[PDB]
Symmetry: D2
Subunit: 426 residues, 4 copies
C-alpha cells in the first residue's frame, strides 16, 4: 500500500428529491446528520483521511450556509474543497451529466485519476486501497463493489468478475431471469458459504476511480448522450472492451438517500454495544465545523438508548431511542421516542423566549408536554406545547407543507424553521 505519485497531487476527488423535505430550502450536501454533522462530511472526511485534498463538490445551487461549513471546517485548514453549482439560482440532472457539465474544468487539473463519489451513503473508506487496486490492474475504470443479498439486489447495478476482479458482465438493477443469471459465488471474494449463500451478488456502490483520459473519452467522445454513470457509461465502457475493474469493499455501507433509509441509519448510531457506523475513529474520524458549544445541560432527563449532540439544553423529560442534534431545547414534560431531532443553528436568549411568548408565538425547540414519536424534526422548528406527533392512524404519505410537515414511509418530518401551533396532533 503506497501510492506513487501520492494521492495528494494525482487524484482529483469529485463528490456528486427522495430526501424531501430535508432538501426543501437547503442544498442537499448540507442536510444535517448524526446530531453534529452534515451529509457532505462523509465523503469530504473520507477523502482527507485518504490523502486526497483536491475536492470539488458538485451541487445544484450555491448556498452561503454550505460554503460557510466547508470554509470553516476544511478550506481554511496544496488542496481545496470547492463547490461547483449546476445552475445560477435555486429555481434534474444525471450523474454523468453533472460531471460532463464540468469536465472542461476537471481536465484543467494535472492529475492521473478522478475519484467519483456519487450518491449519499454512510460509510468510512480508505480510498487509497481503491486507487491502488486501480493502478495495479492498469484499470481504465474501477468500481467499488459490495456483496449484496438477493433482496436489495435489483436496486443496484450488479456484476460478474473473473479471478482478477475484472468486470466481465454488468447488469443494471436486473430482474426475473437475469436477476437469477447474475447471481454469482460470493466466496471467491473471501466470504464464506453461509453468507456467500445469503449474499449471492456483487453490487456497484456507485463510486469509481476513472483514469483522466478515459473520462474525457467516455463522456464526450464515446457516450456524449449518456446521463447516468451506473446505467450508461459503465455498461458502455465494458461493451467497448475497456479495462473495467472491481474493488471489493467489506465494511459498513448504508444508503441514506431516502427518508426511511436516512431515518433508520441515523437511529442506528444509538445501537449497543457498538453503533452500526461510528463517526469517531482514532485514525480516520468524520470531521465537521468546530463550534465551541458548551457541554449539554440536563435538568431532569431520563435518557435511554440515545445520543446527545453538542450544546443541548434539556429540561425534565424523557428521551428514548433518539438522536438529539446540536443546540436542541427540549422543554418540561416532553417525551421523545424513536426520533431524530436535528436541533438548531442558534440559541434564543431566554429573554427572547419571554417576548415571543407575549406575541403568542412559540420559541425554537420541543414545547412543554409534547410527545414526539417516529419523527424527524428539522433545524429550528418551533413546536408548541401539547403537540403530539404520533400519527395514530399510521398514515404512510401526506404532503402537508402548509401545515409544516411531510409524511413519508410513515415518518413525520417537521420542516426546517416551521411552526407547529400549540395543541396540534399529527
Amino acid at each position: 500500500t503506497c501510492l506513487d505519485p501520492d494521492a495528494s497531487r494525482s487524484v482529483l476527488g469529485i463528490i456528486l428529491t427522495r430526501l424531501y423535505p430535508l432538501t426543501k430550502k437547503r442544498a442537499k450536501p448540507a442536510v444535517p446528520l448524526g446530531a453534529n454533522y452534515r451529509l457532505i462530511d462523509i465523503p469530504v472526511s473520507n477523502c482527507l483521511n485518504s490523502n486526497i485534498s483536491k475536492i470539488y463538490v458538485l451541487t445544484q445551487f450555491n448556498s452561503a450556509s454550505l460554503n460557510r461549513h466547508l470554509s470553516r471546517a476544511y478550506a481554511s485548514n496544496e488542496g481545496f474543497v470547492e463547490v461547483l453549482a449546476a445552475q445560477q439560482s435555486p429555481e434534474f440532472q444525471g450523474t454523468a451529466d453533472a460531471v460532463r457539465q464540468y469536465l472542461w474544468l476537471f481536465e484543467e487539473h494535472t492529475v492521473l485519476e478522478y475519484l467519483i463519489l456519487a450518491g449519499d451513503h454512510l460509510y468510512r473508506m480508505d480510498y487509497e486501497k481503491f486507487i491502488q487496486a486501480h493502478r495495479e490492474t492498469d484499470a481504465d475504470i474501477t468500481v467499488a463493489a459490495l456483496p449484496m443479498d438477493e433482496k436489495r439486489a435489483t436496486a443496484f447495478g450488479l456484476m460478474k468478475i473473473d479471478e482478477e476482479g475484472r468486470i466481465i458482465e454488468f447488469a443494471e438493477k436486473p430482474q426475473g431471469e437475469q436477476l437469477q443469471a447474475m447471481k454469482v459465488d460470493t466466496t471467491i471474494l473471501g466470504l464464506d458459504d453461509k453468507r456467500a449463500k445469503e449474499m449471492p451478488f456483487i453490487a456497484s456502490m456507485g463510486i469509481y476511480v476513472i483514469s483522466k483520459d478515459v473520462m474525457l473519452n467516455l463522456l464526450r467522445d464515446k457516450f456524449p448522450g449518456a446521463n447516468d454513470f451506473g446505467s450508461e457509461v459503465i455498461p458502455g465502457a465494458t461493451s467497448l472492451g475497456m479495462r473495467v475493474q472491481a474493488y471489493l469493499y467489506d465494511g459498513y455501507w448504508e444508503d441514506i438517500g431516502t427518508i426511511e433509509a436516512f431515518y433508520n441509519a441515523n437511529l442506528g448510531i444509538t445501537k449497543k454495544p457498538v453503533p452500526d457506523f461510528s463517526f469517531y475513529d482514532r485514525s480516520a474520524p468524520i470531521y465537521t465545523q468546530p463550534r465551541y458549544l458548551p457541554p449539554s445541560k440536563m435538568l431532569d432527563a431520563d435518557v435511554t438508548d440515545s445520543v446527545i449532540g453538542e450544546g443541548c439544553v434539556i429540561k425534565n423529560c424523557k428521551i428514548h431511542h433518539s438522536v438529539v442534534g446540536l443546540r436542541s431545547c427540549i422543554s418540561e414534560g416532553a417525551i421523545i421516542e424513536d426520533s431524530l431531532l436535528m436541533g438548531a443553528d442558534y440559541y434564543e436568549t431566554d429573554a427572547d423566549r419571554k417576548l415571543l411568548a407575549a406575541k403568542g408565538s412559540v420559541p425554537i425547540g420541543i414545547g412543554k408536554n409534547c410527545h414526539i414519536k417516529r419523527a424527524i424534526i428539522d433545524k429550528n422548528a418551533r413546536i408548541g406545547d401539547n403537540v403530539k406527533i404520533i400519527n395514530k392512524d399510521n398514515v404512510q404519505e401526506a404532503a402537508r407543507e402548509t401545515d409544516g410537515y411531510f409524511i413519508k414511509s410513515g415518518i413525520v418530518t417537521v420542516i426546517k424553521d416551521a411552526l407547529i401551533p400549540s395543541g396540534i396532533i399529527i
Copy 2:
C-alpha cells in the same frame, strides 16, 4: 466609534502568569475545567476575543501535552510557553509575578509593542481587554489596574487601592484591616458604579490584571525595583510612590477565584446552576475556545441525569447522575451513582482490544466501574475506578494526603489523582 490605533494585534503583547493533586502530574495551565476546557483556555480566549494575538504563557515547566493543546487549539500571532524550570531533574521556580516577568524581560523587549497586558492567576471570567487598553492610552497611564469593587467584609482579603477624583491611584494597602481598612474606603462612583452599589461596595481591589507600557516595564523591573517579586504588592505600589501615573479601571461582571481546591470544585459545579450558570463558557461573540477533537455525540444507555452537564463523547450506561459535571470521553458503568461531582474524563478511549487485554489480567478499565457510588469528589483524567467502589467519605474527613492510594482529601473533597487506580471494593 472607539478603536485602538495601532490595533491590539500588533501593539499589545499578552503575558499570562494550591490546586494539588490536580497539579501532581501536569503543568498547572493544563488543568481540566468545565467538562471540555483547560484553565489556560480562559486567559488565552479573552486575549483572542480582544484582538490580542501575541501571547506568552509563563509557568514553572512545560509539557508536550500543554504544547499540543496550545498549538492545536490556537494556530502574526503565537502562543508560547516560557518556563522557570527546563527539566524536572533541575528543579527551579519563579519567586512571584514580577520575578517571572523579569526573568524573560529580555525576550519581551525584542517585541515592538506599546504595552504589556499582564494576566496573573486563575480566575473564571470573561473580559474584553480592548476598552481596558484604550483607557490606558487615553489617560496616558503608565500602568492601568483593573479594580474590583467589593464590600468591607470581602475587602480585608485583597490588595486595595485608593484613588483621587480622576480615578488615578494614589495609595495601596495589602489585605488591610481595622484602622488601615477604614482609611481605604473610596467613592466607587468615580469609576462608574451606580450610587447604590457604590455605597454597598466602597472598596476596590486589584485583580492581577494590568496594562503596563513597554518602557515603564523595563524601568520598573530592571532599574527601580530589581528586587521585587510581586507586581500587585511591590512593583505597582512602588511605581505609584515614584509619582508615575497608575490609573484605575472599573471591572464589572462575573469573577471567581478558582486557585483553591474548594473554590475550583464550586466554580465547576456552578455551571449547572438551574436558571443559567453564573459563568457561561459559551458566548455568541466571545466564546471560550479549546481544541477541536471531533468527538462523537455522547451515548447514554439508561441514564437519569439531574442538574448536570455532559461533555463531548461520553459513553454512559445505566446510571444516576445528579448535580455533577461529566468530562469529555467519560465512561460510566452499569449501576453507578454519581453525585455532586466533577468527572474530568479521559484523554482517550480504551479500544476493546485493550479491554480484553485488561481482562486477561482481571485489571480495571479506565472510567467509573460498576455499582460505584461517587460523591463530593473530583475524579481526574483517566482514573481507573474498580467495581463497587464507594467514594462517600462518611466520617467526613476534611484533610488526608493518601497519594500512594491514589487520592487526596482537601476541604472535605476527595480528589482521585490522574491515572490513578482505585481497586474494586475500596471505600473512601
Copy 3:
C-alpha cells in the same frame, strides 16, 4: 480614532466584478487571472485592498471558472471569511455571459441576500490602485447614505471619458452625466474643495468621476435591482443615477491617490511599465501596511550571467544570460538567452521551468524552449506566459502597424503594441 462597528469583516460583503478589450491576454484564461507587475495577477489588487481593509467575505464574479484562478485564490488567500468565485456560464461549450455590472450582481443577488451584512462593497473593473475601504464605509454610515460613490477629481481634458457626477454644497450627488462633452460637460463643473480637495488642485480639477467603487446598503440593493430597475444592466450609468432620481441619499466620497484604469492593452501596458518609474513607482505593490498579496512560490533568487539592466524591474526566480534589459518588467521564472535585447516590454514570465533534458529534446525536434531566445530583440511588446521565442526573433514593428490580428502566427498587435500569445511559438528568424 474611530472605526466600523460592527467591524467590516462581519458586516460588509465584498463583491468584485471581473470576467475583449484585453484580448489576447484573455484568450485562454479568466480575466481576473491576467499576470500583473511581474509577480501578481489583476485579481490580487481588489482582493488585497479588501483584506487590508478588514473585509474577508469576498465574492469574485467572473465569466467562467478556472483551475488556475482557483489555485491562485486558494493558495494565496483561502487560509469567518472566504474568497469564492461565482461564474456566469458553467463552461466554454455552452457560452454564457453577463449583460453588465448590475446584471452580474442581479444574477447572484439571491445568494448575497443570504448573508447577514449591512452593506455591499462593489468593486468593478480593472484598475490599479490601493485604497482603505474602511474610512469609505464609515462615511457611508456617518452620512446615513443609501449609496456612497468614490469620486475621482480630474481636469476637463480627462473628464469627457468618464461618468461624471454633480454634487450639492454638502457633497450629496444630485446628477450624473455619462461621458459628457460640450454643453453637458460644462454643466458638470463642481467645487471639489467640498469633498476635501485643496484649493490649488480643486481649481485644476473641477470635475469628479465615478470609479466603479460603491458602498450600498443591503436593502437598498435589493430594492434597486429587483424592484425599481429590474431591467438595468449597468451600475454607474443606470442603477445609481436611477437611485438618485428616486431621491435616495447618494453621497460622494473623495478619492485622493494613484489610480489608473488598465482595461485596454495600451493602458495595461503603460501602467505596468510605470512601476519602473525613475523617482518612485507611481504605484507601489509593496506597502508597509497595505501590501498587494500574491501566491507564495518559494522561487529562488534570480540569476544573471551578464546583464546590463536599466530602469527595469525583475521578478522572482528569473534565469538571465548576457543581455540588455531596458525600461522593462521581467516576470517570474523568465528565461532570457545570450545576446537578447529587451526594450520597453512586459515579459509575463513562465508557469514552470524547463530543465536541460527538456531543452535538449526541444533542440532535437528543432523546437524552441520557453523564454526569449538568443540574439532576439524585443521592443514595445507584452510577451505572455510560457512563450517560446526562437533565436534571432525581432519584435520591432518597423512599419509601426497599430492593429493586426495575427493569432495563427502567435500574436496580436493593438495600439502599436505587439502581444505574443500565451504558449505561442515564434519560429527563429521571424521579424514582426
Copy 4:
C-alpha cells in the same frame, strides 16, 4: 514502499561561534543564507519534504525573530525552539540529554537527529525505512570519502552487512589504512567505491526511542558528543549500529570561509552546486510579499539577486545580493555576500538621517565592496572602500563595526561604517 506508521506520526525531528560575528546578535539558526533564506530553513525544509512534521529546534537561546520566522514560514505537527539558556550545550549528546524528558513525552518510534550546519538536500524517508528494515538500534548516515580527506574526519568501519563495527576519530597512517571499507556494500558503484574507500559520519542519525534513553541516561550518562562518544559506545556495547550511504552534494558552512564560499557557490554556471529551489523538495522560507527588484543602471555578472532589492547605477560581480538590499549610486560590488535588510528606509527616513549626519541602510555612494560579507541593516557611508589591500587574514575590529577572518571582511549587523573609511 511507504513508512508505516508514516513519518509524521512516528518520527520526531530534532535539529541541533565559528560563524562569529554573524552570531554576535542573533540566534545561530537564524543566520541569513543564500539571499532569501536562513540556516534553519535547510533542515526544517528537508524534514517537511520527508513528511516529518514533529520538529524541535535546539539552540543556545531564544529570539522573537527566530520564532517569528519559524511560525510564519512554517495536522498535529510543530516547529518549536528549545533553549539551553533562559538568557543573560557541552555537545550534541548534552543538548539532547538536557531535553530528553520532553522528547520522551512523545509517542514516536524514532528520533531523527540532525546536527550541524550543511548545505544539503536529503529525503529522510528511505533513511528511516532502512533503519526499520534492518532492525537497527541506530542508523548513521555515511559520507563516502577518498584517503586524502578521510584523515580529517571521524570514520567508521563496517561489516559486510553494512553494520558499523568500529570508529576512529581522524586516524592517520596504519589506523587510517585499517579503516578502508568496501563502499560497494553500502550501494556505491564499483568505480566510485574504489575512488572513495572511506566513510565518515555526518551528524545525521536515526535512533530508536527506547535506545536513546538507555544510551543517554543509563549507558553513557556523561557523554557530550554522539559521534565520538555515544554512538561508538553503543557499538562497543553490541547494539545494532547500521550505516546508510549518503550519496549527494554536501557542503560544510560552519566557518566564515566555508560559509562564504558556499553562499557564493550558487552563482556558479550552468547550475549551482546546490540548488535551493526544487520542483519536489524546495527549501522554504517566510513569505514576505516584497516587490520585484528595481535596477536603475546595473551591470551584473555571475551574481544572484534576491527579493525586493533597490539598486541604482552600479556594478555587481560574482556576488549574492540579499533581500531588501538598497545599493547607492556608483557602487562596485565584487565577490561579496550582501545579506540585505529586515526593512526599508523611506526618503522621509533617509533625509532625517543625513540631516543628522548619520548614514542610511545600504551600500553608500561610490563604495567599492570586495570579498566581504555585509550583514543585515549595515549602514555603509559614501566612498567606503572594503578592499583589504594588505590582505590581512585576521583582525578584530568590533568597536569599528567589522571583523576579518581568513582575509574575508565581515561587517556586523546594524554596524555603521562612516564615510571615507578604508578597510
